[PDB]
Design a binder for these strands. Structure first.
Length: 370
RNA sequence: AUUAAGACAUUCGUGAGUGAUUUAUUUCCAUGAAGUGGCGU
């Protein structure tokens, strides 16, 4: 039937998950490139597809080449005809091969024990404060670009009011304790180094395009690994290997573990995130892509949200795999993890319906909440 | 096939130029070539 795996990635060296105004972008190519802390789920999909072809010896080698029909059909049945695409955001099927669903990438801490792994999540933006939202006729009201919404009274749940100077919840990641949420600073998880690189020969070149590039390489602290859950169609197999995930040939180690069958991985991820639940808000655990933010703000009053940029590399089975890849023509803005959507009385169901209507994005571990 | 791939912080560069171990300082101070006669009553 279907087969469920847990896939742990261990950084062998300093990795580089980059992208936005990255190098070789032109328009002041901006040699200084900073690494994103996580890869896009598209990178996860592509890595899975690349390794699936590696196991079956179906990769493209040598300069521009061709394909015979039967290997084309086996690539169809294994990986799919087309990469992760934003245009298929409302397709009810993943449009790929044996891959059905992947959980959002999760940060996992591996203590030196048989003891289980602690799952670390970004700290909710509302953690530490209470939002009361007093609404009995006009007593206070705010317009967000021309929409009526209640007033967000925010107090430190410890009265005073929200001092943005004290606000440091965006710098923390959380995990479950006995009954205390364990807060970890982002620096205690990711260490960064700036690298200076040049081309030695020196030929005719112009700045941002000849030499002298600086890249941010991230290292993940000792006992921390990246993980996700995958469902495969059952006629394939995933083998432990050494992978390339990210930019500048960032090399990782796959440990593929088979979890017991009949296990919906979405329920597993939500069980992991259960300790952050609050009855009055929806916690965004992974980037979300509501097609109308004004529509969402209609039913949510205070959206304690941030934004991340998403851009995808678009390739098919027959594409120049050695060349400037085709990037997604549109830049897609996603809701940062840890974002808080505060809804009206009731009305939770149709905002959840708006969030889950992107079933293709739900399957690629994006619009996940708790 | 993954906002990817490719790229030595490198090429040129003398720890060198100018600059007396020189200036000041009596081998000097004290000091008798001196002392005494002897016998032959």
């Amino acid at each position: 039937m279907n087969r469920h795996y847990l896939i742990t990635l261990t950084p062998m060296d300093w990795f580089f998950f980059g992208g936005e105004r990255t190098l070789d972008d032109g328009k002041s190519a901006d040699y200084i490139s900073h690494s994103n802390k996580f890869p896009q789920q598209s990178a996860l999909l592509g890595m899975i597809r690349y390794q699936l072809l590696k196991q079956h010896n179906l990769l493209s080698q040598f300069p521009y080449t061709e394909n015979k029909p039967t290997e084309k059909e086996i690539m169809k049945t294994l990986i799919g005809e087309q990469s992760f695409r934003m245009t298929e955001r409302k397709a009810k099927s993943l449009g790929l091969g044996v891959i059905k669903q992947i959980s959002p990438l999760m940060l996992i801490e591996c203590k030196d024990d048989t003891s289980s792994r602690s799952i670390y999540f970004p700290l909710p933006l509302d953690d530490g404060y209470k939002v009361s939202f007093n609404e009995t006729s006009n007593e206070d009201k705010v317009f967000y670009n021309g929409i009526e919404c209640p007033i967000p009274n925010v107090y430190p749940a410890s009265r005073k009011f929200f001092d943005h100077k004290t606000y440091n919840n965006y710098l923390f990641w959380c995990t479950q304790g006995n009954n205390q949420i364990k807060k970890l600073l982002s620096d205690e998880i990711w260490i960064s180094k700036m690298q200076i690189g040049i081309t030695k020969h020196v030929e005719e070149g112009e700045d941002n395009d000849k030499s002298f590039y600086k890249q941010e390489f991230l290292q993940l602290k000792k006992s921390f690994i990246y993980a996700f859950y995958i469902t495969l169609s059952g006629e394939s197999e995933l083998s432990s290997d050494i992978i390339q995930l990210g930019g500048q040939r960032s090399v990782f180690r796959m440990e593929v573990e088979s979890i017991e069958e009949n296990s919906d991985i979405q329920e597993k991820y939500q069980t992991a995130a259960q300790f952050l639940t609050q009855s009055d808000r929806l916690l965004i655990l992974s980037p979300t892509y509501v097609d109308n933010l004004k529509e969402l703000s209609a039913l949510c009053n205070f959206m304690w949200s941030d934004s991340i940029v998403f851009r995808n590399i678009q390739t098919t089975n027959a594409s120049n795999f050695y060349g400037k890849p085709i990037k997604s023509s549109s830049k897609y803005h996603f809701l940062k993890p840890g974002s808080v959507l505060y809804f009206k009385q009731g009305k939770r169901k149709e905002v959840e319906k708006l969030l889950m209507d992107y079933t293709y994005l739900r399957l690629s571990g994006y619009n996940i909440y708790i």
